Design a protein around this ligand. Sequence first.
Ligand SMILES: CCN1C[C@H](C)n2c(c(O)c3c(=O)n(Cc4ccc(F)c(Cl)c4)nc(C(=O)NC)c32)C1=O
Ligand SMILES: CCN1C[C@H](C)n2c(c(O)c3c(=O)n(Cc4ccc(F)c(Cl)c4)nc(C(=O)NC)c32)C1=O
Ligand SMILES: [Mg+2]
Ligand SMILES: [Mg+2]
Ligand SMILES: [Mg+2]
Ligand SMILES: [Mg+2]
Ligand SMILES: [N+]
Ligand SMILES: [N+]
Ligand SMILES: [Zn+2]
Ligand SMILES: [Zn+2]
Lengths: 368, 368, 184, 184
Amino acid sequence: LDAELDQLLQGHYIKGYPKQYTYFLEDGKVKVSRPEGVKIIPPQSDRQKIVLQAHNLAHTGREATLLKIANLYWWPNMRKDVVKQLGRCQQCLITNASNKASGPILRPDRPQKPFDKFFIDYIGPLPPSQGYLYVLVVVDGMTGFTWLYPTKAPSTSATVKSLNVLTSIAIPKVIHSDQGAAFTSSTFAEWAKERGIHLEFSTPYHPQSSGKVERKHSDIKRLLTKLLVGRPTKWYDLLPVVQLALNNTYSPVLKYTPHQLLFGIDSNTPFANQDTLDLTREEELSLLQEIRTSLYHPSTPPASSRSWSPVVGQLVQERVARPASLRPRWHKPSTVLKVLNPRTVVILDHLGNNRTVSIDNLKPTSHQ
Amino acid sequence: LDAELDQLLQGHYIKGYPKQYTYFLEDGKVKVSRPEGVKIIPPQSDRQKIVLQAHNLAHTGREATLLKIANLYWWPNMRKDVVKQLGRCQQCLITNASNKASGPILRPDRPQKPFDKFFIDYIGPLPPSQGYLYVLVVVDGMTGFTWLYPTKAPSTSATVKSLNVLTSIAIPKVIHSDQGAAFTSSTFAEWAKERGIHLEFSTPYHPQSSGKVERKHSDIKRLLTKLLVGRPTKWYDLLPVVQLALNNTYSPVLKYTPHQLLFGIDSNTPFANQDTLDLTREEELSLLQEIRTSLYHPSTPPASSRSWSPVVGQLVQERVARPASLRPRWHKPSTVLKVLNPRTVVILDHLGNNRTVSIDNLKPTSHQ
Amino acid sequence: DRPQKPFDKFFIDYIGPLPPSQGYLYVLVVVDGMTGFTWLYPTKAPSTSATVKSLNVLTSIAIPKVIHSDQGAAFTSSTFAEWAKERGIHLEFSTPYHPQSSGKVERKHSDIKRLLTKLLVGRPTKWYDLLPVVQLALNNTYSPVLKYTPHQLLFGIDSNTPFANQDTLDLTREEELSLLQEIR
Amino acid sequence: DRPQKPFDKFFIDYIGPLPPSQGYLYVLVVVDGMTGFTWLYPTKAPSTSATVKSLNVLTSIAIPKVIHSDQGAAFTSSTFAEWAKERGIHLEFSTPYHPQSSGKVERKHSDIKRLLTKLLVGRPTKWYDLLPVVQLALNNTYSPVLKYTPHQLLFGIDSNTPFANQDTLDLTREEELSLLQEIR
DNA sequence: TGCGAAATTCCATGACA
DNA sequence: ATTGTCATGGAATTTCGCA
DNA sequence: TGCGAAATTCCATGACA
DNA sequence: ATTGTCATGGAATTTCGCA
Ligand SMILES: CCN1C[C@H](C)n2c(c(O)c3c(=O)n(Cc4ccc(F)c(Cl)c4)nc(C(=O)NC)c32)C1=O
Ligand SMILES: CCN1C[C@H](C)n2c(c(O)c3c(=O)n(Cc4ccc(F)c(Cl)c4)nc(C(=O)NC)c32)C1=O
Ligand SMILES: [Mg+2]
Ligand SMILES: [Mg+2]
Ligand SMILES: [Mg+2]
Ligand SMILES: [Mg+2]
Ligand SMILES: [N+]
Ligand SMILES: [N+]
Ligand SMILES: [Zn+2]
Ligand SMILES: [Zn+2]
């Protein structure tokens, strides 16, 4: 503070203050003759209050805060004192946007067998049809085979009814879903435990995690659309036709229909493939097991130039899920406990609870 | 049809049908022994009905339609007949998504003088504050200087009141706005004509065109947010403070505040810049005219690898603006009349009206 | 002659009346010929309509080349014939009073009648909910003639519910006396 | 001594009572010293409150280093002093009964009184709407002493509304007899 | 005429419904 | 008959201070 | 052993609120 | 305590038919 600035006035050298400039007194304030003009050097004990005043004018970031300060003052390492404040402004940290991209997506292994993993999810509300408003969509991970059930609500009770009808055919090892109320209810958990089905949940508000079923929605709605052009939206009667149409549609990258991957042979549907007519069932099922293992699998894409990836103990912030008008889009900072994989982490929130969260719903808190 | 297939059976050569394969008759149908197995060759007169049946199963694109057909049939140039049908399926064309990117954005010249062009737009509804729900935002193109007016509605009448208060300071040559009802009303047109202001309109549903004002919204709301943290959302009293705070904030790329670009000198606000204290007003205004012409101007970014750019007479489709549930996202095909610039076109719609439209709200109709 | 495949032939048939269960009285029984896989649908009547409604659910999953039935009214109706023609399904009837299937189908069909009877005693009214577990049992039941369950023949994999407990399927002395009480 | 700049000094002052216009009776007059640029605000009273309300609109655009006024009550109040101190504005008063400004400001202030009077005759009640056009006129009016209008001094550019028609600003014989009718 | 560190500039990211 | 924009905050690059 | 054209594969784009 | 996906339709590349 006032000590440092005395030594300086009487020609002595202090670290940080370059000796080739003339430091004087005027109007009771230590000044200096810089290329840009003459600036005041406030005492160290003053500098924090100055930065804070500058930053608070509009809650500006680094440079815009610096430019205000530099109008009146100079001292060594100004930006370090600016950055220090930005890291401590709660309002800026919970309001500003991130400018770092997530690391590249994972492409999880295709489940190995039909019925290993089910991906489920609701679409809706749709326009009322026969008193129905939603659709339960179930997608077998390995085959893409899809089951569609109309419901009046995205409820547990309607999910149970529907899954009882489906599980009649086979029971799956795992059912993966998002955290919609229907799937997280204890009534649902009991229903699963009863049947030896393990429930797996997506990180919250991250539908890419349910990507397998999510992507099917687009085809479902797209086909419903084409069929209903010029007519009123009576979709209920179409669900069966849609289901069947899709399950028997070829995926150009795979060269198989989801039905084919499920059964190894077309049923009595138009343009059914006849390539295995001369094989025994057993020969057919052998060639099927072969097809199932040699299906195309996409690899992780290249990282973008400015991606970040989580480290244990790092300060990070969770995205607010449904932010109200004029309210911050980010939660207070939290700490990374475990890095489950490069795109998933467990955080301790300040409350402090443990939460498993997608990297996409995080930013690394700025300025350390 | 039946003619062609006769010549073929008796060993003769027909163009398209490779001579090294054995073409026979069986079950009253012309067949062929292909590497993949034995396929039927339907008569030309049948082929269209076959393609249509295949395509209609799920309204599939090229390859997935081909794969069904290839299960039972072979004939020369199958995909040409497949593509022909896809180009004539009204349902597919108005429903499917584009897979071509727009060409790279234009970066229009910064208006040359304060008051050359005004960009305006509403934000809202916001939470009620003092009975107010919207904000009129006015941004001078050259300076970024911003005026904020609270309103009860995004109406012409409130736009007029507000602009009468502002135009008290100066009249602008042009006012650019989107096509919100408030700005397109004849009452508004009269108000402009009366004052020699020319109204310029954004292509519909393309807020990038109002980018100058749009971008200011984000700063406005962001600052309102930081200020209202932990308090109820009483924003009305803050508009003046926000306006002032922003207009005097430095843009790091420009190194000037919008106020500075407007006036050439800071007013009595904190950290005011004192660099021109020794210049006369006239000397100051001279250095200002200099600053105004040498401001950074960004250039058009590189095109993405799969962009398209409009050509006169091309079939294109306009995006449906507010598509209802299960209804096509695209209008029927229309024709490009004029190419106003590489990112803007005039189209004849089928009704047929003339419409000036953003390239971003278009796709080039597929399959010609 | 090409080897037998799934979806080559569905054997369909009705079972009932039964004691009312959630207002349902019959069961449409569908058995795949080649695999012995079995679908069950509860109906309120053995009518062409309930049959069409039911097979509409099944045929949105898999379509048979041939449906085979006896000459029950529901199956011989001209409505049911139209339905089948619309779908390119060939209909096949066994001669009156002389029902032929296959050994596999006759045996399966017996297991169903026996398995139902076992669980409908002590709770003759709660079968509607049991249908899912009946089918799972039936389809994960080991075949003497082939080495494989119907599940394995349909999907080419082991099931996640192996019914490794082959059951009595016989009535105990407790259940025999209780069933002769219900008839009373 | 450093040269005079915009925002160095705002000369503020009230004009009225006037005939009611949309319930307004006065005009707060703000003139920039250096440029001669003029802001007008309609008020319902020459009170500290209406003054603060008004200058709050102005000071969200530009803040003066010095406000100069006469010793009107509104400006000498201790509320008004607090307001000014909050904003780092130095207050300046002219001695009682001896109002000093500058030549530029006195002349401008005269043009306002004269220009208002000209348009308030024949429509003494519709001035509220005219304020915008009054200011445009005043700020795009050529200065004899400098080569430039206030607009040009404030912004460093030509205006898009040049008032190239210098006006009589004098009352015609028609308006003189009509104004002496309104007083009656 | 070259070092280490501070200052400045670069620029991808995201958000204006 | 028109057209994206620009705060942000680590990284890259340039300039500074000193020799 | 090399040509022109057809077939197949590649893969960016967009959309599942 | 978990994780994107895949139809689409021009362009790029490979294979085909023939010599
Ligand atoms: C309440 C439980 N819950 C949480 C959120 C509401 N959610 C749920 C969904 O099913 C979806 C959904 O399908 N999409 C559409 C979408 C958008 C981008 C994509 F990449 C993909 Cl794959 C899908 N979005 C959301 C969402 O998170 N919006 C912000 C969503 C859900 O059930
Ligand atoms: C009714 C007249 N009308 C038409 C549409 C409704 N619109 C109007 C607006 O002011 C906005 C707006 O601010 N944003 C936010 C936004 C989104 C992406 C961007 F790049 C940018 Cl720059 C801005 N979006 C839309 C819109 O078109 N949503 C689909 C929008 C408007 O007034
Ligand atoms: Mg969901
Ligand atoms: Mg979803
Ligand atoms: Mg708008
Ligand atoms: Mg907008
Ligand atoms: N995995
Ligand atoms: N331009
Ligand atoms: Zn802040
Ligand atoms: Zn189609």
